[PDB]
């Protein structure tokens, strides 16, 4: 399923604005927040779109008639016993490895960020790049 995040990753009032941009990309971080990108036109099931996603062991690239979420993301959590951040589930689409350190790299595209589950609490309280 999809989660509605856009408000009318920043927090301790929650704010979210991860807009779809017209179609270089760069990001400086130590937290490995940027995980991938969506490239396409309508960004829905009507046309084919390109999905690029990186994870801990590999990178997957697919072209499909994806039905994307308005606020697509990859969920992560801090594993209580192992004391490290781990992936949970993808919330990028409903239907269908190269990521302080600066990382420098179809009519529209959107950036996929790793979102801490602590942000997915139901309350109003509880990640930067260039294009």
């Amino acid at each position, epitope marked *: 399923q999809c989660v509605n995040l856009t408000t009318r990753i920043h927090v301790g009032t929650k704010r979210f604005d991860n807009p779809v941009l017209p179609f270089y990309f760069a990001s400086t971080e130590k937290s490995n927040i940027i995980r991938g990108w969506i490239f396409g036109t309508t960004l829905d099931s009507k046309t084919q779109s390109l999905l690029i996603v990186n994870n801990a062991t590999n990178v997957v690239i697919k072209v499909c008639e994806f039905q994307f979420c308005n606020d697509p993301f990859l*969920g992560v*959590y801090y*594993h*209580k016993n192992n004391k490290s951040w781990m992936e949970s589930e993808f919330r990028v689409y409903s239907s269908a490895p190269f990521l302080k350190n600066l990382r420098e790299f179809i009519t529209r595209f959107q950036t996929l960020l790793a979102l801490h589950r602590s942000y997915l*609490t*139901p309350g*109003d309280s509880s990640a930067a790049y260039y294009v």
Partner: antibody, heavy 117, light 106 residues
Framework: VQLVESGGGVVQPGRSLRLSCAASGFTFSSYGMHWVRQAPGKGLEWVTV????????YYADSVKGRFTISRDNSKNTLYLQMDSLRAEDTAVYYC????????????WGQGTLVTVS | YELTQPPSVSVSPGQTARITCSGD??????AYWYRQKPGQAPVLVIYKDSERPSGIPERFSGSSSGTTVTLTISGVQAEDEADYYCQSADSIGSSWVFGGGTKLTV
């Protein structure tokens, strides 16, 4: 912080019933709300959550597609619309406030009994 | 994401009661414990496995290991004769889960 449930009653299977939880003593619009139900002699079962701004809502599988959760932040009131009720839905329904910044429930109401028969 | 806990615990007054709860999810996320007395709404006793609310006395403590979490109640009194529940949430925040509930008999 006070949460007051109302709208409970006795209905036949297939009928609908609407519950309401009036909130006071806090900034209602900043907190997410939950419904939890407890059948007599049974433990606690989580039913549904709605986010502070109503942007997201989730349901337990057992009530998915039948229950609808909504809120009016201008009336400080939480609503639960239960359609197509079944005998298995007999329970005391509590409204509870989500703790800000965490995954537990801090404040609870008194609960209202709903019987389906 | 299921939570399993024993249906009951029997403890004599003055002894220490240890109420356990297990499940794979509990190795990933924090557990929360509630105490419910008949006719009353559930009251939070422990959060984040081992922390107390300001309304909860030092007799209540918690611990965890692997997939199991434990609520420890020392100096058990008659007033502690209640149904205790373990609670958690999934990794995406779309679902909340309670265990069956443990009836603690003093």
């Amino acid at each position: 912080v006070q949460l007051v449930e109302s709208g409970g009653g006795v209905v036949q299977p297939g009928r609908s019933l609407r519950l309401s939880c009036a909130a006071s003593g806090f900034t209602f619009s900043s907190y997410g709300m939950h419904w939890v139900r407890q059948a007599p002699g049974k433990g606690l079962e989580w039913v549904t959550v709605i986010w502070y701004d109503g942007s997201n809502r989730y349901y337990a599988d057992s009530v998915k597609g039948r229950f609808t959760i909504s809120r009016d932040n201008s009336k400080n009131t939480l609503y639960l619309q239960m359609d197509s009720l079944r005998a298995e839905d007999t329970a005391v329904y509590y409204c509870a406030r989500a703790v800000a910044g965490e995954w537990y429930f801090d404040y609870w109401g008194q609960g209202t009994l709903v019987t389906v028969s | 994401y299921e939570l399993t806990q024993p249906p009951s615990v029997s403890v004599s007054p003055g002894q220490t009661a240890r109420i356990t709860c297990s499940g794979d999810a509990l190795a990933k996320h924090y557990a929360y414990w509630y105490r419910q007395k008949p006719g009353q709404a559930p009251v939070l006793v422990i959060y984040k496995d081992s922390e107390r609310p300001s309304g909860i006395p030092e007799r209540f403590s918690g611990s965890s290991s692997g997939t199991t979490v434990t609520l420890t109640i020392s100096g058990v009194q008659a007033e502690d004769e209640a149904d205790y529940y373990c609670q958690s949430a999934d990794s995406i925040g779309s679902s909340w889960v309670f265990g069956g509930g443990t009836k603690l008999t003093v």
